[PDB]
Write a protein that binds this DNA or RNA. Structure first.
Ligand SMILES: [Mg+2]
Ligand SMILES: [Mg+2]
Ligand SMILES: [Mg+2]
Ligand SMILES: [Mg+2]
Ligand SMILES: [Mg+2]
Ligand SMILES: [Mg+2]
Ligand SMILES: [Mg+2]
Ligand SMILES: [Mg+2]
Ligand SMILES: [Mg+2]
Ligand SMILES: [Mg+2]
Ligand SMILES: [Mg+2]
Ligand SMILES: [Mg+2]
Ligand SMILES: [Mg+2]
Ligand SMILES: [Mg+2]
Ligand SMILES: [Mg+2]
Ligand SMILES: [Mg+2]
Ligand SMILES: [Mg+2]
Ligand SMILES: [Mg+2]
Ligand SMILES: [Mg+2]
Ligand SMILES: [Mg+2]
Ligand SMILES: [Mg+2]
Ligand SMILES: [Mg+2]
Ligand SMILES: [Mg+2]
Ligand SMILES: [Mg+2]
Ligand SMILES: [Mg+2]
Lengths: 91, 97, 76, 252, 135, 112
RNA sequence: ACAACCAACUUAGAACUGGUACGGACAGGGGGAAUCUGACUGUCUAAUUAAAACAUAGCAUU
RNA sequence: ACUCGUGCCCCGUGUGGCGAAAGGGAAGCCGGUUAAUAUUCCGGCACCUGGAUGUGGGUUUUGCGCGGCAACGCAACUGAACGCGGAGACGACGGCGGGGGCCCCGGGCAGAGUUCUCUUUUCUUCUUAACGGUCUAUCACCCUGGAAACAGUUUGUCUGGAG
């Protein structure tokens, strides 16, 4: 079944706070409650514990991530840039 | 290399392999392992242990660039595989290089 | 309170210097005889199912330490 | 008139920051011989949530160069750091995320966190979630380094100042609406007694410069001079301009 | 190729002797009725000789250079084989899977192993075997 | 279904005023004040419960014997055994790698 | 595949019946069409004002 | 370390107090007893802390236990400094499972109520403490083994070649 047309996870808020605010909250809530594959062990068991803290239930590893996503695009771009600018210094 | 996937598919189709850490260690101990594959995201301690076992067995090691998910998919399974051993390479030439 | 499994350990306990007194509790409804010896820390109870061994244990016990028979309806 | 709320806040009392659930301040290691000349290796034991702080903190254990003990430090966690990770702090440390390096040994264009204003101060700049300091340039003869701050300002710090390679974890925390008075209350209940806030125009003249009147109105220009007396500084202090920002701003 | 044979030096990774170094006396690659798995009869050191210095007297040195051995049946999965090896002729057939059935045989085998290991230790050879592992 | 009372001057349910209900040989229902539950010691590496050690209040461990407080192997208490095996294997591998690295550096950088 | 033994309640269907009555006391929403106003939950003049006032999230400025 | 207190030798980064009769925390239960106290008195049966030295037991005599593949076990089974770790030690809410007590039902025992008529009837009692011994009790962990025709599995979920 579907149980809902568009409100999705944001249906717990009823008719309150306004549609635009409900959509904005839903956008972050979906990613913040989603499950993620562990980079270290490969299991789909990484979940958010605190605002910027993501832990794997299987391999028990904890990593520092984004507020509502495990990795932010800024950090990914910074990692790529760091690798490039470090390799051009090393060799 | 990219050809490792085709070689692995041929080896599984024709020869025989063991998938998993315990079976790989058993093969290395018994000396019937011809080559071992270790996934990139294998834990460092386990990877070093497997490398030491293969040094003892004089068995070649290939460091598969993919994760355990990708290694299992290459082996044609629906589960992950952190490490595996090839006990018999058949029509494939995986042991040539 | 502690249960003593066998007659040898019970009599060895009764030989102890700190053994103060002993008493036989007869439960006819269960046909049971309990030998209880009061030491310093614990009260030791040995359970017997027959009267022959009870009488032989009573006669083989040390004679210095006093023995009672637990009268029915002990007074305050 | 009365002493206004902004004046009362500086007395302390009920406006003191809450500290029970905060375990330790987030600081670098003290600048020592190992960090000055080579590098030192530390192990990340845990990534913890610090109440009142958006960014997570990292507990990192180091060995004492001079004693058999071991020392646990509390760093601001950079995003990508994980438990069981080796981090390296020193002049000769590798240029990887989580390593603490002096700005002199860092190329131009890299971002760092918890940058020291002066070497040995154990971190002052760019220590909030999603924030960082960019290494704009170097002046080796002067022994200094130009950096760009989160606010957009340009600063010059001695090249010996240290920073942690990467971006502070905690991502886009302010990307989701609080949506609820309770959530604002929970946010501030571990920081300070500053919520809720009553508007000055809703007060009486005894309570605030914006005072009373038969309509809720300020009644005089809300921009207040930089050198106004204490008790007068309510509104927009030393405002260069007001109104909606309708374009790019020359200042940065 | 086989590397788990007699003389092969290994480390025990489980049990009371975890972290202790052993030398294989007899590998049993196929299981027996008991222990139906690849295992090995091994002899090892329980109490390593203490550190000795150039300043101690010979009596103190000889009292400190004492080894308490042990004899074990151990699963292969509870061993870590090492590149090191120890061919001692005195330990050729000290234990034969029947010494473990009688405590007196265990004591006699331990005495023999103790004597052989002490002789080898004061020979000055295979110092890695007699140096305790730090972990 | 007789009702019960606290047997101490503390009238509040303060996580230290734990009680359970008993029936006495006198035939009446009563309260027994009980202490907090014992807690199993955890591994210092992985944090799981350690098998073979009783869960007691901290002061209670001072009156039971050592073999009941520990298990007979290296890091008997405070480590779980799997962590001990990992430590052993890791230590051996790091020393082996260090030895081969020093020999390689001596053979390939000091050969002249 | 039936028989025997054990065990509570929950639901559904039918006949008959009386005072056409049955949530028989108790318990227990009046509803609808609109206008002004504050978005909502919340708070205040203890002892004449509970509100459209305050707060709020959101927005903007310094 | 001396007949005798006072002779030295090591470690050092720290170096106060008050503040909870609901926070943390060593240890006591039952029966009886007074006009009025009782987990305090009496009887029985226990526990903790501290200090002392005994008997037995264990271990060893160039030395500090033994067993189990293992998870670990056993009545002990040396251990300074220095260090590491655990416990103390922690939110709110939801459904599920185990246990105690209470409630309810059936039978029996003893007493009481009703009994023109009926009711194998209605009601009450039938108890078992701390402290111990012994055998068990989910989760977890170990060994064998190697899973796709994927399997196991909760009300819900989830778990597995990292087995
Ligand atoms: Mg004034
Ligand atoms: Mg306001
Ligand atoms: Mg007003
Ligand atoms: Mg004024
Ligand atoms: Mg003015
Ligand atoms: Mg207005
Ligand atoms: Mg006007
Ligand atoms: Mg009706
Ligand atoms: Mg109503
Ligand atoms: Mg309103
Ligand atoms: Mg108020
Ligand atoms: Mg009023
Ligand atoms: Mg008034
Ligand atoms: Mg009123
Ligand atoms: Mg005090
Ligand atoms: Mg208290
Ligand atoms: Mg008393
Ligand atoms: Mg008394
Ligand atoms: Mg004592
Ligand atoms: Mg003795
Ligand atoms: Mg507390
Ligand atoms: Mg009971
Ligand atoms: Mg009821
Ligand atoms: Mg009944
Ligand atoms: Mg009982």
């Amino acid at each position: 079944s579907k149980r809902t047309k568009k409100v999705g996870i944001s249906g717990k808020y009823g008719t309150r706070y306004g549609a635009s605010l409900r959509k904005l909250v839903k956008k972050q809530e979906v990613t913040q409650h989603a499950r993620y594959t562990c980079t270290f062990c490969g299991k789909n068991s990484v979940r958010r514990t605190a605002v910027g803290i993501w832990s794997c239930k299987s391999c028990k590893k904890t990593m520092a991530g984004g507020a509502y996503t495990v990795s932010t695009p800024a950090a990914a771009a910074m990692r790529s840039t760091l690798r490039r600018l470090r390799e051009i210094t090393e060799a | 290399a990219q050809s490792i996937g085709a070689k692995l598919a041929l080896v599984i189709k024709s020869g025989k392999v063991v998938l998993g850490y315990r079976s790989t260690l058993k093969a290395l101990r018994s000396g019937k392992a011809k080559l071992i594959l270790i996934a990139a995201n294998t834990p460092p301690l386990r990877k070093s242990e497997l490398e030491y076992y293969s040094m003892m067995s004089k068995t070649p090691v290939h460091h598969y660039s993919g994760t355990n998910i990708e290694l299992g998919t290459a082996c044609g399974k629906l589960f992950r595989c952190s490490t595996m051993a090839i006990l018999d390479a058949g029509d494939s030439d995986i042991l040539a290089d | 309170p502690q249960e003593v499994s066998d007659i040898k350990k019970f009599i060895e306990i009764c030989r102890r210097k700190d053994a103060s007194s002993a008493r036989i509790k007869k439960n006819p409804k269960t046909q049971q005889i309990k030998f209880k010896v009061r030491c310093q820390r614990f009260l030791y109870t040995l359970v017997l199912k027959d009267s022959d061994k009870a009488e032989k244990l009573k006669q083989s016990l040390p004679p210095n330490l006093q023995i009672k028979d637990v009268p029915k309806r002990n007074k305050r | 008139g009365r002493v206004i709320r902004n004046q009362r806040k500086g007395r302390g009392s009920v406006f003191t920051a809450h500290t029970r659930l905060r375990k330790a301040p987030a600081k670098f290691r003290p600048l020592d011989y190992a960090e000055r000349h080579g590098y030192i290796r530390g192990i990340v034991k845990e990534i913890i949530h610090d109440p009142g702080r958006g960014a997570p903190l990292a507990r990192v254990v180091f060995r004492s160069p001079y004693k058999y003990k071991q020392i646990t430090e509390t760093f601001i966690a950079n995003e990508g750091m994980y438990t069981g990770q080796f981090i390296y702090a020193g002049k000769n440390a590798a240029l990887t995320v989580g390593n603490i390096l002096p700005l002199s040994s860092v190329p131009e264009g890299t971002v760092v966190s918890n940058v020291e204003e002066k070497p040995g101060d154990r971190g002052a700049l760019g220590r909030t979630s999603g924030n960082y300091v960019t290494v704009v340039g170097h002046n080796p003869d002067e022994g200094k380094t130009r950096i760009k701050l989160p606010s957009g300002a340009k600063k010059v710090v001695p090249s010996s100042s240290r920073g942690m390679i990467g971006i502070v974890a905690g991502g886009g925390r302010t990307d989701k609406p609080l949506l609820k008075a309770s959530r604002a209350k929970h946010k501030f209940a571990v920081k300070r007694n500053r919520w809720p806030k009553t508007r000055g125009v809703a007060m009486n003249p005894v309570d605030h410069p914006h005072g009373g009147g038969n309509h809720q109105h300020i009644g005089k220009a809300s921009t207040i001079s930089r050198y106004a007396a204490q008790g007068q500084k309510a509104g927009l202090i030393a405002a260069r301009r007001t109104g909606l920002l309708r374009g790019t701003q020359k200042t940065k | 190729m086989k590397f788990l044979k007699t003389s092969r030096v290994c480390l025990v990774t489980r049990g009371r002797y975890a972290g202790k170094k052993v030398v294989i006396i007899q590998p049993v690659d196929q299981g027996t009725k008991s222990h139906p798995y690849g295992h090995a009869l091994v002899a090892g050191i329980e109490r390593y000789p203490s550190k000795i210095t150039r300043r101690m007297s010979k009596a103190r040195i000889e009292k400190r250079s004492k080894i308490k051995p042990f004899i074990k049946v151990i699963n292969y999965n509870h061993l870590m084989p090492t590149r090191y090896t120890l061919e001692l002729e005195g330990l050729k057939a000290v234990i034969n899977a029947d010494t473990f059935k009688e405590p007196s045989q265990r004591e006699e085998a331990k005495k023999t192993v103790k004597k052989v290991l002490e002789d080898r230790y004061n020979s000055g050879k295979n110092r890695w075997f007699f140096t305790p592992l730090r972990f | 279904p007789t009702r019960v009372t606290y047997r101490r001057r503390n009238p509040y349910n303060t996580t230290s005023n734990r009680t359970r209900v008993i029936k006495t040989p006198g035939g009446q229902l009563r309260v027994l004040h009980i202490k907090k539950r014992g807690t199993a010691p955890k591994c210092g590496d992985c944090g799981i419960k350690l098998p073979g050690i009783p869960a007691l209040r901290p002061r209670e461990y001072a009156t039971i014997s050592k073999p009941k407080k520990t298990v007979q192997r290296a890091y008997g208490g405070s480590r779980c055994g799997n962590c001990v095996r990992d430590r052993i294997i890791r230590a051996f591998l790091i020393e082996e790698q260090k030895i081969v690295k020093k020999v390689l550096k001596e053979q390939s950088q000091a050969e002249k």
